[PDB]
């Protein structure tokens, strides 16, 4: 962390907005997930993985940003981009 | 596959429903994620992996089922439950 991707075109991945619901409730949290990583791509080489939640692009937090805003961050990045990711699973400890 | 869990009355895992949206649209698909697996439980013993998605319960597909319906499939199950899972893998056939 972060994942550094060097491009010569594209980075080679797609992202999707998700909602994660708790139990049977209507309450959710909003995230951006790496949906697919093309094999042989800079993103694939760099170790970016499908299912990874993105928290930052080039150090900028994606919290509160809508899908198109995140895409825009990736597009203006140009040739090299840094992506901070976190596991998509429970990371907390109960006592 | 599938994961075979040998319970007694708790399997030892938590599930969440997630919505994955297409682009900037309001269209989504639903996925049932293994959110947490309790150490030292039947689910842990069975090798159920947090972060993976449930596709079948005792051979029955979960497409089109909401959270409470997936719960019911698990409750109606006996001591042993077979769960089919898949990781996030959205690789396309590109030529």
UniProtKB/Swiss-Prot annotation, chains A, B:
Say which domain of life the source belongs to: Eukaryota
* Tissue localization of expression: Highly expressed in most normal human tissues, with an exception of in testis, small intestine, colon and peripheral blood leukocyte.
Source taxonomy lineage?
Eukaryota, Metazoa, Chordata, Craniata, Vertebrata
Query: What is this protein's record name?
Result: Microtubule-associated serine/threonine-protein kinase 4
Q: What residue ranges carry the coiled-coil annotation?
A: none
- Residues in domain PDZ? 2-89
Family note: Belongs to the protein kinase superfamily. AGC Ser/Thr protein kinase family.
Instruction: Report the subcellular localization.
Output: Cytoplasm
First and last residue shown, out of the full length, are 1140 to 1231 of 2623
- Membrane-spanning segments: none
| Organism (species) | Homo sapiens (Human)
Q: List the disulfide bonds.
A: none
């Amino acid at each position: 962390q972060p994942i550094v991707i060097h491009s010569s075109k594209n980075y080679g991945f797609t992202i999707r907005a998700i909602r994660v619901y708790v139990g049977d409730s209507d309450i959710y949290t909003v995230h951006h997930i790496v949906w697919n990583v093309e094999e042989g791509s800079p993103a694939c080489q760099a170790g970016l993985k499908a299912g990874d939640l993105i928290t930052h692009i080039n150090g900028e937090p994606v919290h509160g940003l809508v899908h198109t805003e995140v895409i825009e961050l990736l597009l203006k990045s140009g040739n090299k981009v840094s992506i901070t990711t976190t596991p998509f699973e429970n990371t907390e400890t109960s006592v």
